[PDB]
Amino acid sequence: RTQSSTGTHGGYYYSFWTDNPNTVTYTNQNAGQFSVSWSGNQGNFVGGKGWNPGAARTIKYSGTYNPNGNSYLAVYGWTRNPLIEYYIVENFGTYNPSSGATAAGEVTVDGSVYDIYTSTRTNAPSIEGTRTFQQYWSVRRNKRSSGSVNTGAHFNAWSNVGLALGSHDYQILAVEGYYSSGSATMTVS
């Protein structure tokens, strides 16, 4: 029982995915606002608002992020040609989502050091189907739940590590949860 919802709402691209619709409620609100509540420590989901296509833009976000367990708050997106999945992780709960990726340096932007990681996913689900693709991570040391993200500084930092980003697909401010509970109301602009 999976559910995937995408579209435009309030002028923004949105995306929500879960493998347990009964324990997660995603709510589109006005402009770049959305809310998610999840309970019962059951199910995997990722949802938020942003743009399609993405770009090297400054993403402003604010709101409240209240996880209880495995969860993260991230700018999240894809490029094509080449196919890349990327994460700018602003906050997380009890598990660091970059675990198992390869350490690849540091970048200082937007008031914090971010640790950079790279990984390869082999025949894994992608926006193009089952593929082998590269992943980039920047993980903020100084966790926060509101501020601005200069995505181009991350894109430039990643391009000195491995393959450069391709043509942008979607780009969202995502809340994720994995067999946990919590609530969040965020606004992107």
UniProtKB/TrEMBL annotation:
Classification via InterPro entries: ConA-like_dom_sf (IPR013320), GH11/12 (IPR013319), GH11_AS_1 (IPR018208), GH11_dom (IPR033123), Glyco_hydro_11 (IPR001137)
Pathway(s) of this molecule: Glycan degradation; xylan degradation
A single GO BP: xylan catabolic process
Enzyme Commission number: 3.2.1.8
Molecular function, one GO term: endo-1,4-beta-xylanase activity
All copies of domain GH11, residue ranges: 1-189
Reactions the enzyme catalyzes: Endohydrolysis of (1->4)-beta-D-xylosidic linkages in xylans
Superkingdom, natural source: Eukaryota
Active-site residues per Swiss-Prot or TrEMBL entry: E85, E176
Keywords annotated in UniProt: Carbohydrate metabolism, Glycosidase, Hydrolase, Polysaccharide degradation, Signal, Virulence, Xylan degradation
Family: Belongs to the glycosyl hydrolase 11 (cellulase G) family.
Name of the molecule in the record: Endo-1,4-beta-xylanase
Biological classification of the source: Eukaryota, Fungi, Dikarya, Ascomycota, Pezizomycotina
